[PDB]
Amino acid sequence: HHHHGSKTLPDKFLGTFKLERDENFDEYLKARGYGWIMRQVIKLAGVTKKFRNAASGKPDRYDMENLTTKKDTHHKDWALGEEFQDEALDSTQHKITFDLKDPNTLTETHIKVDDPTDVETYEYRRDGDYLVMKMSWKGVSTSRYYKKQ
Ligand SMILES: CCCCCC/C=C\CCCCCCCCCC(=O)O
């Protein structure tokens, strides 16, 4: 049962979401330290995000995939507020935690294993048929729009 201590992911966040457009992603990637070549390939790559109830059938456990033009990530059987270690899109190991700030806000925090000082949180919000991913680095903000499929 899902009403005994673990958080439930609102249905709002379940499904397939395809990257359609973004705002200020280039200056954000620049603040993060990416040179021109890397920024072009990062910002113009196709992204499909998938969030589902865990295929294993464990209640309040989830699966999420980041499917891109090149690298894909597959995070299986995670729980909200529970940290796990896995390979991220940069092909390195990260400590990841998905959590709920409130029923309308999903967070995703990454800590680099080889750089524990590198800590970053991504925020997801639903806005109509869109999942909006928000990020901020050194005062530079960006929003990426994923159309629910
Ligand atoms: C997240 C940073 C990735 C750095 C390494 C990228 C390597 C090869 C090019 C792949 C470009 C497509 C992925 C762009 C990142 C999408 C981020 C997201 O939607 O979570």
Author numbering: -5 to 143
Can you quote the paper on this entry?
Using a micro-focus beamline, a dataset was collected with diffraction observed to beyond 2.2 Å. Due to clear evidence of radiation damage, the data were processed and scaled to a maximum resolution of 2.3 Å. As-p18 crystalized with two near-identical copies of the protein in the asymmetric unit (coordinate RMSD 0.19 Å for all equivalent heavy atoms), but with incomplete electron density in the ligand-binding pockets. In the crystal structure of As-p18, the electron density associated with the co-purifying ligand was of insufficient resolution to determine its conformation unambiguously. The electron density within the binding pocket indicates that a single resident fatty acid molecule could be in a U-shaped conformation as observed for other FABPs, and sit with its charged head group either buried within the protein’s binding pocket, or pointing out towards the pocket’s opening. The head group buried orientation is the more likely given the precedence set by other FABPs and our NMR data. Since As- p18 predominantly co-purifies with vaccenate, we fitted this ligand into both copies of the protein in the asymmetric unit. In E. coli, these are principally 18:1 and for As-p18 almost exclusively vaccenate (cis-11-octadecenoate). In both the NMR- and X-ray-derived structures, the N-terminal residues Asp5-Phe7 form a 310- helical loop that is an extra secondary structure element characteristic of the subfamily IV in mammalian FABPs. The βB-βC loop is poorly defined in solution, consistent with the high crystallographic B factor values for this region, but there is limited evidence for flexibility from the 15N relaxation data.
